[PDB]
Design a protein around this nucleic acid. Structure first.
Ligand code: MG
Ligand code: MG
Ligand code: MG
Ligand code: MG
Ligand code: MG
Ligand code: MG
Ligand code: MG
Ligand code: MG
Ligand code: MG
Ligand code: MG
Ligand code: MG
Ligand code: MG
Ligand code: MG
Ligand code: MG
Ligand code: MG
Ligand code: MG
Ligand code: MG
Ligand code: MG
Ligand code: MG
Ligand code: MG
Ligand code: MG
Ligand code: MG
Ligand code: MG
Ligand code: MG
Ligand code: MG
Ligand code: MG
Ligand code: MG
Ligand code: MG
Ligand code: MG
Ligand code: MG
Lengths: 226, 155, 206
RNA sequence: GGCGUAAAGCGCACGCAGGCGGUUUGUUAAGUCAGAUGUGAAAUCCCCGGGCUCAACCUGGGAACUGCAUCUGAUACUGG
RNA sequence: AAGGCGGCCCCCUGGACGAAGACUGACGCUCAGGUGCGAAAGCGUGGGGAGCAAACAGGAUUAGAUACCCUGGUAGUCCACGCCGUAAACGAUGUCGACUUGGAGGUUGUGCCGGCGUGGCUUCCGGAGCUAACGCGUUAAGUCGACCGCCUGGGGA
RNA sequence: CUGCAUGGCUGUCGUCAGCUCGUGUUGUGAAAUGUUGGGUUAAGUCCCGCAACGAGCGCAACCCUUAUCCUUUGUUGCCAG
RNA sequence: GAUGUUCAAA
C-alpha cells in the first residue's frame, strides 16, 4: 500500500475517455491514448483511512460481505473472503439479497438442509431419480447463497469491487444504511458508495492487490481484539 | 409511545378479462413526537391488511425534524407533485390549524403550535409528502451557525 | 371448462364408497332403489340433525347404516327412543333387519357437506352471501384446513342475472390424484331463484 | 397563478411612443430613508376599567386612525 | 425573419460566419398602436394551356352511393401585373442576454505539430434539475433578469 | 310457457399453456416487476441473463392399461417330464 | 383481393 505498489500493478488505468463519468473528475489525473488515468496521489492517501475504517468495523466483531460478481475477480474475492473467515457473494447478486432477507433466509435454510442431507444424511429413498435433481439444486443454491450461508444476519459493512457492476448491491446497502467500500472506475459513479476508492478493476493482479489489502486489515483487527 | 394515524383509505381497481379486481390502499402517518415523523403507503385486498403494511413502511421511513419548543424554527414552504403546502411557527397555546391530512402529520410529529394552509392539489398522499419535505427543509439555528461558522449570534 | 367429480375420479384411489356391498343383477337395482329410499327418508326428518354422510353396507342378514351426524344428541335423543323408531322405519324400507351405527363428527367446519348446508340455510335466511362464505372459509382455516374453496352461484341476492362467485384460501390440487378432496354440493331454494353452493376442502395427500 | 400536449406565444419581422438598461468619477437629492413638527373631528374598532342584578346596552381613559403636509438631515442604490 | 427556396449559364443584389487587428464609444434590449413580408386556394385583367384535375358527365360498386374505383373532363394549376392576408403559417415552445455535467455525429471555416486546438450552424442520446405525466435536458420545458403577446370551466362563439 | 329468471349437467377454444400470490424493489399514483428477454421444451418444460426472490393453481407426475423379468397360488385354466 | 348498416336507460 503505497504510490509505488499500485503503479507497479498498473491499476492507474481507466476506461476509454468516451465511456468516462463526469463525477470522476476529482479522481482523474489525465488521458493517454484516449484512456483515463486515476490520480494515485488523490486515492492512496484516502485509501488507507477506508482500510482503517474496515478495521474499526472488524473490531466490533462486524460481518464484512465481499461482492465480486465480476469474472476478473471471481475466484479472487472468494479466496480473499474465506482467508479472513468472512462471507462473500460470487456467482451473481440476487436482487433483494439484503432488502428481502426473509425470502433469501428461506432459500438458505433449504440449501443447508440439502447440504446436511445430500452428504451426511442417509441417501436411502434415492429412487435413482430425484437424486440428480436435489444435488443439482444444492449446487445452484451453493453458488448463489453458499458464500452467505452461515451469515445468519445482515452485513455490518459491505465491500464491492466495481460500483457500476454491483449498482443493485450498493442500492440495497444504502437502503439498509450499510457503509459501502467500492473500487469505483472512471465509468462508475461514487454517489452511493460511502467510502469511494478510485482504481482499475479490470486487471486480475490489480484487484488481488485491493483484496489482499482489505483482507489484512480485518485479520489485523481480529488479532488486536484477541 | 409511537403514535399511529390513518390519513386516508381508498378502493382502487384493476380491470381483467373477468371484470373488476377491487383493492384497498391506506395512507398512515407514524410519529413518536419530538419531531420524528414518517409516512407509509400500503396496498392489500382488505382495509385492515392495508393499514398494517402502511404502518410498517412508515416506521422504516421516519425522519427527524428540527423543532423550537412545540413550534416550527422558521416559516416553511414544501411542494410535491403540484401540491404546495405552507407552514409557519405560531404562538404558544394557538393549537394546530391545518387541513385534516396535514394536521395529522404535524400532531404525531410533535408540533403543537402552527398555522398551516395547503395550496394546489389537495390529494392526501401528495400533501403529506410535501409536508414531510417541508419538515426536512426546516433548519435549526445551530445548523445555520455551523454552516456559516457563526457562534450563534442570531439567538 | 367442465370439472370431473373430485370424489368420483379418485373413488377407487382414496374415497370410500357410500354403498359397500355385493349383489348380482337380480337385486342390484333393487338394493340401489332401497338405498335411495333410506337416504331421502333420513335427510327429510334429520335436517336439523346436521347429518353429513349416509354409508350403507348390506350383509345377506341385515342393513348396516353408518350415519356421520355432527350432533349424536338429537339423532338418538334420550335413551335412544328416536333411534329405535328410526330402525323400525328403515328396516321396513329394505324389508330386512336393520343395524344403525352412529359416527362422531369431531371437526364439523372441516366437512364439505355440513359447511355447504349451513351456507344454503344462511342464503334462505337472507344473510348476505358475501359474508357467510368468508365466515365459513375463516372457520375452516382456524381449525386446520390445508385448502378451502366455496362457490355460491345462482341469482345471488335476488339479482336479475345469475353470477358465479368463488373464494379460495390455501391450496386445492384437484389434478393430483393422491390428494384428498372433501367435496359436496348443497342447493339453496331462495325465493328469487335456486342457488348452488359448492365446497372443496383439501386436507393433505395420501 | 399560468401559456410543448389541459384554456393560453401574435405567421414572421421592422419599428415610434412607452418600459428597462454595461461601467467609473464628480455633482444634485427627484425617488428613497431618518429625525422633528403640525394635522389625521367625534362616534366606531381594540385594550384596561366603571355603571345598569347579569348581559346586550351605556360610558372614562388609553391605544389606534403610520395617511397627508412641511422643515431638517443622509446619499447606498435608482433618476437627472 | 418567416412564408419558403433544387438542371445549367450569365447579370443585378441581400444576409450569415471565420481570421487578425484598427476604429466609434452604450450608439443597447424589447415593443402597444403602426408598417412591411407572407403556403395553398381564391379574385381582377391580359396571355398561355402538355400533364394533372374541383365542378360536371358516364360506367361500376352498393339496400342506396350526389363518394371511394374506372373512363373522361372545365375552372384552376403556368406567366405578367394587381388584390386577398389565411394554414396543424407547428418546435403545437415570443424575443434578447447570462449561467448550468456530459457523450456520439453531420456541416462550414480556422490555427498547430496522422493527431491536436478553436469558432458558426445543426441531429441523436442523456446527467442534475424541472414536469401532472409524457417528456425537455447547455439549441431546456434547468436557474435568472428585461420587455411584449395571451389565458382564466365546456358549449353559445 | 320463459334456458334471456335459475340450479345441476354439458359443448367450445383446448389439453390451450396459461392464471395468480407472498415479500422485495420501482413509480406521486392507478399500477408494474417476477410473468420480460436469449435459447429450449409437448408445456410459465428447462436453462442462462435479468430487481427480483420464492410460492401456489394449471403442465408434468401420482391413477389405469399394455410392452419385459421375478416371486406366490394351481382350478374350473396348463402339460416339459 | 369486392361488400357487410345499426343497437334508450337501469
Ligand atoms: Mg386546482
Ligand atoms: Mg371431461
Ligand atoms: Mg392555473
Ligand atoms: Mg392547448
Ligand atoms: Mg412562433
Ligand atoms: Mg447603471
Ligand atoms: Mg429628497
Ligand atoms: Mg376618530
Ligand atoms: Mg424586435
Ligand atoms: Mg403590432
Ligand atoms: Mg396561388
Ligand atoms: Mg387567374
Ligand atoms: Mg384525368
Ligand atoms: Mg378522376
Ligand atoms: Mg390564426
Ligand atoms: Mg399557433
Ligand atoms: Mg437561453
Ligand atoms: Mg433528450
Ligand atoms: Mg445538457
Ligand atoms: Mg343458457
Ligand atoms: Mg339464447
Ligand atoms: Mg399441455
Ligand atoms: Mg413506492
Ligand atoms: Mg408484488
Ligand atoms: Mg406481468
Ligand atoms: Mg402472462
Ligand atoms: Mg410485461
Ligand atoms: Mg421467454
Ligand atoms: Mg410450474
Ligand atoms: Mg426468467
Amino acid at each position: 500500500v503505497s504510490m509505488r505498489d499500485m503503479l507497479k500493478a498498473g491499476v492507474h488505468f481507466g476506461h476509454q475517455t468516451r465511456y468516462w463519468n463526469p463525477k470522476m473528475k476529482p479522481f482523474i489525473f489525465g488521458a493517454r491514448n484516449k484512456v483515463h488515468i486515476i490520480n494515485l496521489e488523490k486515492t492512496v492517501p484516502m485509501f488507507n483511512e477506508a482500510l482503517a475504517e474496515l478495521n474499526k468495523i472488524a473490531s466490533r466483531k462486524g460481518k464484512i460481505l465481499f461482492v465480486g460478481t465480476k469474472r476478473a475477480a471471481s475466484e479472487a474475492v472468494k479466496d480473499a473472503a474465506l482467508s479472513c473467515d468472512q462471507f462473500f457473494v460470487n456467482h451473481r447478486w440476487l436482487g433483494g439479497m439484503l432488502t428481502n432477507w426473509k425470502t433469501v433466509r428461506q432459500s438458505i435454510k433449504r440449501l443447508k438442509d440439502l447440504e446436511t442431507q445430500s452428504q451426511d444424511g442417509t441417501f436411502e429413498k434415492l429412487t435413482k431419480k430425484e437424486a440428480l435433481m436435489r444435488t443439482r439444486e444444492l449446487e445452484k443454491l451453493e453458488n448463489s447463497l453458499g458464500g452467505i450461508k452461515d451469515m445468519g444476519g445482515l452485513p455490518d459493512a459491505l465491500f464491492v469491487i466495481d460500483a457500476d457492476h454491483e449498482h443493485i448491491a450498493i442500492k440495497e446497502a444504502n437502503n439498509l444504511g450499510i457503509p459501502v467500500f467500492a473500487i469505483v472506475d472512471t465509468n462508475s459513479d461514487p454517489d452511493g458508495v460511502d467510502f469511494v476508492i478510485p482504481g482499475n478493476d479490470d486487471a486480475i493482479r490489480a484487484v488481488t492487490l485491493y483484496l489482499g489489502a482489505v483482507a489484512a486489515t480485518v485479520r489485523e483487527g481480529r488479532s488486536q481484539d484477541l | 409511545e409511537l403514535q399511529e394515524k390513518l390519513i386516508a383509505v381508498n378502493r382502487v381497481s384493476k380491470t381483467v378479462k373477468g371484470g373488476r379486481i377491487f383493492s384497498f390502499t391506506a395512507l398512515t402517518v407514524v410519529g413518536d413526537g419530538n419531531g420524528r415523523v414518517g409516512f407509509g403507503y400500503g396496498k392489500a385486498r382488505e382495509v385492515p391488511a392495508a393499514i398494517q403494511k402502511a404502518m410498517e413502511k412508515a416506521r422504516r421511513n421516519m425522519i427527524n425534524v428540527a423543532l423550537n419548543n412545540g413550534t416550527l424554527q422558521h416559516p416553511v414552504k414544501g411542494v410535491h407533485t403540484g401540491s404546495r403546502v405552507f407552514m409557519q411557527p405560531a404562538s404558544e397555546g394557538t393549537g394546530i390549524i391545518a387541513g385534516g391530512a396535514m394536521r395529522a402529520v404535524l400532531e404525531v410529529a410533535g408540533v403543537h403550535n402552527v398555522l398551516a394552509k395547503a395550496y394546489g392539489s389537495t390529494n392526501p398522499i401528495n400533501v403529506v409528502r410535501a409536508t414531510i419535505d417541508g419538515l426536512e427543509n426546516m433548519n435549526s439555528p445551530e445548523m445555520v451557525a455551523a454552516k456559516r461558522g457563526k457562534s450563534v449570534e442570531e439567538i | 371448462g367442465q370439472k370431473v367429480h373430485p370424489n368420483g375420479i379418485r373413488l377407487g384411489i382414496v374415497k370410500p364408497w357410500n354403498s359397500t356391498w355385493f349383489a348380482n343383477t337380480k337385486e342390484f337395482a333393487d338394493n340401489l332403489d332401497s338405498d335411495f329410499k333410506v337416504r331421502q327418508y333420513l335427510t327429510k326428518e334429520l335436517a336439523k340433525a346436521s347429518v353429513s354422510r349416509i354409508v350403507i353396507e348390506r350383509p345377506a342378514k341385515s342393513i348396516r347404516v353408518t350415519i356421520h351426524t355432527a350432533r349424536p344428541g338429537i339423532v338418538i335423543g334420550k335413551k335412544g327412543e328416536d333411534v329405535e323408531k328410526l330402525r323400525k322405519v328403515v328396516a321396513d324400507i329394505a324389508g330386512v333387519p336393520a343395524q344403525i351405527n352412529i359416527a362422531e363428527v369431531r371437526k364439523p367446519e372441516l366437512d364439505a357437506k355440513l359447511v355447504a348446508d349451513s351456507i344454503t340455510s344462511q342464503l334462505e335466511r337472507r344473510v348476505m352471501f358475501r359474508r357467510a362464505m368468508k365466515r365459513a372459509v375463516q372457520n375452516a382455516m382456524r381449525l386446520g384446513a390445508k385448502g378451502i374453496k366455496v362457490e355460491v352461484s345462482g341469482r345471488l341476492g335476488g339479482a336479475e342475472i345469475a353470477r358465479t362467485e368463488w373464494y379460495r384460501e390455501g391450496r386445492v390440487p384437484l389434478h393430483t390424484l393422491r390428494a384428498d378432496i372433501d367435496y359436496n354440493t348443497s342447493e339453496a331454494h331462495t325465493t328469487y331463484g335456486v342457488i348452488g353452493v359448492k365446497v372443496w376442502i383439501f386436507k393433505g395427500e395420501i
